[PDB]
Amino acid sequence: ETFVMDDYGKKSTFASFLPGIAGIRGIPIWCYYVNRGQCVVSFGVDNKDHAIMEFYPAHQAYQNVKTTGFRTFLKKNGTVFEPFSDENITHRMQIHMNGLAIEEQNRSSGMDTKVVYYTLPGENVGALVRVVSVTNQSGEPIELELIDGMPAVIPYGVSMDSMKNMGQTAKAWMQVEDLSEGLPYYRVRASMDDTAAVRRIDGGNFSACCEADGRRLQPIVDPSLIFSYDLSLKRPVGFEERPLKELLLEEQMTQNLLPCSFYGITRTLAPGGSVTLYELIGQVENKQLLKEYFAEKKDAAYFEAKKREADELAEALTDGIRTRTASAAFDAYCRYTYMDNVLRGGYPMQLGNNKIFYVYSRKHGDLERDYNYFSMLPEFYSQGNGNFRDVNQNRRCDTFFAPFVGRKNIQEFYSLIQLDGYNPLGVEKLTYRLSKERAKKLLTDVKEEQRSALIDFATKPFTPGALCRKFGEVFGDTWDETLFIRVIDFAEEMVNGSFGEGYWSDHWTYNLDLILDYLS
Amino acid sequence: ETFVMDDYGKKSTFASFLPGIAGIRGIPIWCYYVNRGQCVVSFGVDNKDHAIMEFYPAHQAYQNVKTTGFRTFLKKNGTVFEPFSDENITHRMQIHMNGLAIEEQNRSSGMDTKVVYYTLPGENVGALVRVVSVTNQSGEPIELELIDGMPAVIPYGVSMDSMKNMGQTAKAWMQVEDLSEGLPYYRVRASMDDTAAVRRIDGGNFSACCEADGRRLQPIVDPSLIFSYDLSLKRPVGFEERPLKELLLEEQMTQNLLPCSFYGITRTLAPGGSVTLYELIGQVENKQLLKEYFAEKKDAAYFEAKKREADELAEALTDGIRTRTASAAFDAYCRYTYMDNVLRGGYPMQLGNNKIFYVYSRKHGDLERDYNYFSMLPEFYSQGNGNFRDVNQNRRCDTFFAPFVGRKNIQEFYSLIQLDGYNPLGVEKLTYRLSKERAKKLLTDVKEEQRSALIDFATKPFTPGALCRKFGEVFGDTWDETLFIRVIDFAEEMVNGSFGEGYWSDHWTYNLDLILDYLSVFPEQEKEMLYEEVYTTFLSRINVNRRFRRYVETENGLRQYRALNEASRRAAAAEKLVRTEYGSGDVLTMTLMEKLILLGAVKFATLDAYGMGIEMEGGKPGWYDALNGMPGLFGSSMAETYELARMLSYTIEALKQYPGEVALIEELGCFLDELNLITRLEHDNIMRDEELLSFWNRINDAKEIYRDKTYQGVSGKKMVYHTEQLAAILEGFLEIVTCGIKKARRISGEICPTYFTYEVPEYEKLKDGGIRPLKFVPQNMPYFLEGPVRYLKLPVEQGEKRALYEAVKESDLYDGELSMYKVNASLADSSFELGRARAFTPGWLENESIWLHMEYKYLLELLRSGLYEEFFADFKKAAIPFQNPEIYGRSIYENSSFIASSRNPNPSCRGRGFVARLSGSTIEFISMWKEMMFGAHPFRTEQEELVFSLAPAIPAYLIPEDGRLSAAFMSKTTVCYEFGGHRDYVPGTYRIRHMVFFYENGSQATVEGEKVSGKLAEDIRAGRVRKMEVAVDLEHHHH
């Protein structure tokens, strides 16, 4: 079910990505990875302009992952080792449908490093979960100083163009907040685009790390503490020269810099012992959401449950094509192909009682499709736009796997045929609107101000995720899901055609396939 | 003369660049360098879209130079060493004015590596020369395999945006050619921008390396041969695993990759022996140029001669400011500052016989000024565009160093003043055009097809470099330079104004400086300068909106958000001059006095409601860019008021000095008469009232009538005035301005203000849609240094100036820890609508930092006002050449835009200059140097004859041990002072015993006195005296 590549650092380069599935009630994120270093080179929330780790094309991703990607430094009795930096050391990569794990077995240092990645599922905060475990495989106790994290966190409000073109000038707006609280908040001081209606920026990237207990560790946000004069981020000169405890007592620069996110522990590991760090990196729209999310302690059990949920998401998504043949690779390929087709074209589901909704779709782009400006919607019931041809083809066999779809795809893709035989290029996200009278009838059992808020929200086009977010905002923490289901049921589905740029001569040729599959 | 930084890899980071001087007949290139690795991080030819090594901002440049910069790998008996990769190894950097050299002395490996950079001078191919020498310093012979070069050469045709955004996809177009020939050609297979007229791409980047013999080495263009699986380019796995000879036999991939450029040699070095590689990396427009350039072998002697030429270029460029004092750092700083000022504003030169051309200028940008899209023209006689303010200031002292310039700058920068008092933002490159008949007359002695080619080329606008390129193309290899000179002489100089983006309120304030410098060098031609009718007028591309139309309603109250009238906008590429008969007649011509009167009238009409500041009605702030939100808050600048008072006083003195008749255009005459009537009516109200709404309304109504009448066109009929009437009118204006200044100082405090912000709580809507303000509430602004700087120029009492100096020194504008002056006080409690300055931390960029330009302006004003002791002390405690390089963070011969002040949150960053060496402080230092060395007025006109005298102001710490201080006078004459003793030589505290003149012809003349007049003075100004020996306060130096 999992693909294992040994010594991937010496193999041919390839680019890939986590599927970005956060569940029906989660916030998906985009995370691209390559087979070099600690393998993760770029991840954000919405698009290239909301990246936490800077987006690079495939060539630059291969060239920079060992520097701008996740780093880990182990100090064993004075000397510093960097896992996943020397390809001559035995390393390994395990690829899941919705996860990624790497290992290194350094016999010289007697320490084993394991890093597990997965997108955080089923939460109102989109984040990447990184679990780092270091095991003392030597026969003697060692005094380990462990530091790991990310050397360049892009503050919220810095666009990709701003980085790539004027990083030096854009450093003037970057800052960090809440170092003492253990939840660093990475955002610009003010809107970098002048002549903006709102000068204040509320959103922010965050990081949080803890051991199995759950108490957050003190962050390191100034890369000069670790790397000192080495701006190339190749060797941690400061970490080598000084103990970790002294580093945590330094006055870190929280302004006029491209901040890092590093956390450290000091431990004496018995022979066979290990230390595990649970690190969360994500983005929120305001500090209130971040405080609400961390109102409950996130211990090791929480992260293990979230990892199991992340695996089960892909498992249940691909269970519709489960196959057992003479080739295990064939079955794994079947499941993976179904998941990729879902990512490109969406996964049908019954939203309410009389609606068909396609979830997990997104306008795709990756390190190799660098020309595409991808945009994955950061909300519940996530969905995205798509080209006519791609969405038309990817939904060819939806009726076979989801009989409740019926003729919806045929109607959708023949209603887009213009009178002259051509069609719009773009297929918009599913949006819904509720009429005034029906909305008033539905909201009779609601409090007056809440009724008014839902009236003004639901009479304009909205997505189901936006509606659920509004429900949460206007009801606090507990409400009635049946109200949401009823609003969806009695809402009206908008038309979802956007012209685009031109008229291709082949788009109409894929509708007969939909007709034939439905007739099959 | 050179700055040496040891172990620069461990020092604080700084960004810099080679000046990009290729000579008058060379192709300049841009090359930026940092103090990490092999130090060179980006270089190309024209702009960021024609880079050979990818351009990075300063942060990315620091982070990537050790990887994407030049690399060198030494294999000594099997093991591989990489010089300039470990900071613990002793390394060194030497910085020249037009060169860069780095060294590494690895005792462990016993090998010394030396790399020398310099731009290739005096060739029709722009390239970077890189010389790498490895010396075997061990006591035993070693078998050395050397590989060096660049791991990522950007192929020609790949834009910077293409790289940064879609490098992976753009790799599909990249390819290399001519590997066997030894001249790899890096270009795209076809135009990457689809729907292009020409699919084929002819230009290409190239590299070529050779030993001292000159035979080109076999290149390595596939980085996978050297680095193997390591795409991070950190360690050369392939080079370690295999010998160099086997690598050169591999089949290199020349397509679908980002190619490298590496060359290798295998050698057995005797103890003390060395191997040198001469590597050329550049760009050409076609393979024919590359083949022609390499038609002759380039041996070691060629590269040594080119390096000497590159050094001599900067040497001869800066020889005009050569100085010998007690501080060698001071002299090096003088030369470097002059070179930087030339880079920013251009170097004057005599092109032909009757033309003045500015060479080496360019629209500047660097690793720290990453927002600027720089563009250096890749041709002979290189030049570039520039902003009005920067070019205006940088040419302040051109007449002193280049007397042949004369009044050209004054005419150029007053002809750019529009009828409404504003000006275009951009100053275009000098272009020339030749008429049909003159071109036919010139080309009579030319072959028919060559004559036709030159006719069709020269009848359209061209630059001198383009003309020389065309001459070369159409004549082969040999031709007649006199033909080029004659075509330049008989060509017509085009108008060089480009509108830009907006109207700043301070651009006009720098022209009086040009006038004053010209009068300092040629004092006897003031009347001729004033009454010379050669001043044209730029045609406005957009008109300032009426005040009732500039005001809009917002949530926070009334705002000024519609300064420009978009309905009146005209075509950018159209007629550029105001023509008589409402745009149908001849080009309107005006005298300098008319321009001064127009500026005075318009700026007086631009007073604010309280009659204190000059409104930023143009939609742009003053000299302070980071306050872009000030015009929206009804901002007014007191600095413009001080400059207006100074200009009015100068015009009054000029009118009284040379009485006669002055002709003003009819519209300006009517406007001036209306303003005079308004002042006579409102004088009583101005003297007693606090708010002056009625005066403001009448003034703005007259100004709007004049602006809207002149914008549509001017007939050209001129009214005639006596100098007495204009003197009375401008004296009334100056009296009102002086009362406004007094009121502002009264309501501000112990320090004169700089800006005023007004809030309008009561306004009335109009039927036509405009909004009429009814009450202005002034808001105090934080103290800025520019206020006192402009104020010190006014003719006020000396005691008041000293009191202002003390108040500034004891205020928040003075950084006690750094002993420097900050650009502004704290902005913390000010409004957040002011602009970018509110989004910056204190002590960073233009926010409460030591902005070097304004600090040098303040020091210059202290020097000019006679505060000699204070000027000496503050100059010693604040000048760049006297800084500590450990704290300053870069070479003390180079300037910076700002120094992080004591309020900067980073203790390490305090006292450290950050942005590159092209600040505006260069011209300020040049003015200070000239004032100190020769006094305010070296030439004076007494009894209608030229009189020459020297009044130096030299502090004790500049006088050498022997007491002989020398400086260059007008870039040709050497003045060798000799001082009796070590002390501060304040003017009036000494006397010139005698001066001795050494003529160029060898004859000597000695004058026993302090002043000369007549023939001696004329010879001094004409450059016919080689050297002057001046004895100060004594016959000889006495310890």
Side-chain angles (χ1 to χ4, degrees), chain B residues 555-680:
Chain B
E555 305 85 347
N556 309 126
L558 195 69
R559 292 294 181 266
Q560 192 180 219
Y561 287 164
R562 293 209 292 258
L564 296 182
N565 178 18
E566 287 290 340
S568 66
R569 176 177 295 269
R570 279 182 288 199
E575 177 77 9
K576 295 190 178 183
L577 301 90
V578 167
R579 291 184 170 270
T580 60
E581 307 171 18
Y582 308 91
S584 58
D586 308 334
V587 174
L588 176 63
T589 178
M590 295 156 56
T591 175
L592 178 65
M593 180 61 64
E594 182 176 358
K595 286 284 185 176
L596 290 181
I597 292 173
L598 180 146
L599 274 178
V602 171
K603 297 314 165 180
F604 176 78
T606 329
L607 277 174
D608 58 354
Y610 277 62
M612 296 182 302
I614 302 298
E615 301 190 15
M616 305 174 179
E617 57 176 9
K620 293 294 188 300
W623 174 89
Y624 207 99
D625 294 330
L627 288 184
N628 53 286
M630 278 207 57
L633 307 184
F634 306 86
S636 63
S637 174
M638 294 298 307
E640 320 306 325
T641 296
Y642 304 146
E643 291 285 358
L644 174 60
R646 186 169 67 111
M647 186 177 64
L648 287 173
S649 184
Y650 170 75
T651 311
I652 288 299
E653 298 309 317
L655 287 166
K656 291 178 172 298
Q657 188 64 20
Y658 312 102
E661 306 299 330
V662 179
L664 293 309
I665 55 179
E666 181 270 345
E667 298 80 346
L668 183 64
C670 291
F671 180 46
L672 198 66
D673 296 327
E674 188 68 25
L675 294 188
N676 186 22
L677 179 63
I678 291 178
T679 58
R680 292 200 312 274

Side-chain angles (χ1 to χ4, degrees), chain A residues 36 57-59 63 68 165-166 168-169 173 189 194 199 229 231 233-234 253 255-256 258 370-371, chain B residues 13 36 57-59 63 68 165-166 168-169 229 231 233-234 258 368 370-371 628 832 838-839 841 906:
Chain A
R36 289 294 190 271
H59 190 262
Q63 195 173 270
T68 56
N165 292 330
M166 43 185 298
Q168 175 62 28
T169 307
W173 280 266
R189 205 183 332 275
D194 200 77
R199 183 185 180 276
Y229 54 82
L231 276 306
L233 308 180
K234 172 59 196 178
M253 282 308 301
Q255 290 173 337
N256 299 327
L258 185 60
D370 40 13
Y371 45 89
Chain B
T13 51
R36 289 294 190 271
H59 190 262
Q63 195 173 270
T68 56
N165 292 330
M166 43 185 298
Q168 175 62 28
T169 307
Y229 54 82
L231 276 306
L233 308 180
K234 173 59 196 178
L258 185 60
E368 315 203 19
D370 40 13
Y371 45 89
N628 53 286
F832 280 90
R838 305 295 286 99
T841 60
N906 194 344

